[PDB]
Design an enzyme around this catalytic site. Structure first.
Site, PDB file in Angstrom:
ATOM      1  N   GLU A   1     -49.952  30.307  29.344  1.00 41.84           N
ATOM      2  CA  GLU A   1     -48.843  29.533  29.742  1.00 41.84           C
ATOM      3  C   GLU A   1     -48.365  29.023  28.478  1.00 41.84           C
ATOM      4  O   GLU A   1     -46.977  29.195  28.426  1.00 41.84           O
ATOM      5  CB  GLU A   1     -48.938  28.796  30.918  1.00 41.84           C
ATOM      6  CG  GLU A   1     -49.484  29.214  32.193  1.00 41.84           C
ATOM      7  CD  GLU A   1     -48.488  29.606  33.460  1.00 41.84           C
ATOM      8  OE1 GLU A   1     -49.583  30.175  34.036  1.00 41.84           O
ATOM      9  OE2 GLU A   1     -47.416  29.334  32.484  1.00 41.84           O
TER      10      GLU A   1
ATOM     11  N   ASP B   1     -38.082  29.751  32.975  1.00 38.55           N
ATOM     12  CA  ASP B   1     -39.522  30.377  33.305  1.00 38.55           C
ATOM     13  C   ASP B   1     -39.400  32.053  32.782  1.00 38.55           C
ATOM     14  O   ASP B   1     -38.306  32.041  32.238  1.00 38.55           O
ATOM     15  CB  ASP B   1     -39.312  30.523  34.742  1.00 38.55           C
ATOM     16  CG  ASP B   1     -40.315  30.173  35.654  1.00 38.55           C
ATOM     17  OD1 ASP B   1     -41.327  30.735  36.348  1.00 38.55           O
ATOM     18  OD2 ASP B   1     -40.529  28.514  34.790  1.00 38.55           O
TER      19      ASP B   1
END
Length: 164
Positions: free
Chosen positions: A11, A20
């Site tokens: 991440e 994102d």
């Protein structure tokens, strides 16, 4: 290696609101804020999440706090899910981490949709399941990450993350 280290490789860490792979507003260690297109809606969710006026920016501390909550919620969701629980219980410790990773990325609902792969993982048909998982939007959209998770399920070891 453990779940926290694994997710933090996949991440990353960003202390400022960001988008994102999906274009969604996120912060920290993959903490989605909103699916809404307004930076303002995101900022509002952020302050709600932290309990202060952040002005779009958080500390490392705050990021890890959100991270601890998100991981805890992912595991608890798995345990509460009628489709997920049985698979989770059937798996060894390393593979359990791979399922947790998927849940964190895509949510309970999304993963519970992988009916055929779940079935194969329960049956311990590792090679078959790895081929079936790759046949997904998930794999086509984030192939390097999906392939790390997939290797993890295939091998039951942390090799995909050694490199990284």
């Amino acid at each position: 290696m453990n779940i926290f280290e694994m997710l933090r490789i996949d991440e990353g860490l960003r202390l400022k609101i960001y988008k994102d792979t999906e274009g969604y507003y996120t912060i920290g260690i993959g903490h989605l804020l909103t699916k809404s297109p307004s930076l303002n809606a995101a900022k509002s969710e952020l302050d709600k999440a932290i309990g202060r006026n952040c002005n779009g920016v958080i500390t490392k501390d705050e990021a890890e706090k959100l991270f601890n909550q998100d991981v805890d919620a992912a595991v608890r969701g798995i345990l509460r899910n009628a489709k997920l629980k049985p698979v989770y219980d059937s798996l060894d410790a390393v593979r359990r981490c791979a399922l947790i990773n998927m849940v964190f990325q895509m949510g309970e609902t999304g993963v519970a949709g992988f009916t055929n792969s779940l079935r194969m993982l329960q049956q311990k048909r590792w090679d078959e399941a790895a081929v079936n998982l790759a046949k997904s939007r998930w794999y086509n959209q984030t192939p390097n990450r999906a392939k790390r998770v997939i290797t993890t399920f295939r091998t039951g070891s942390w090799d995909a993350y050694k490199n990284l």
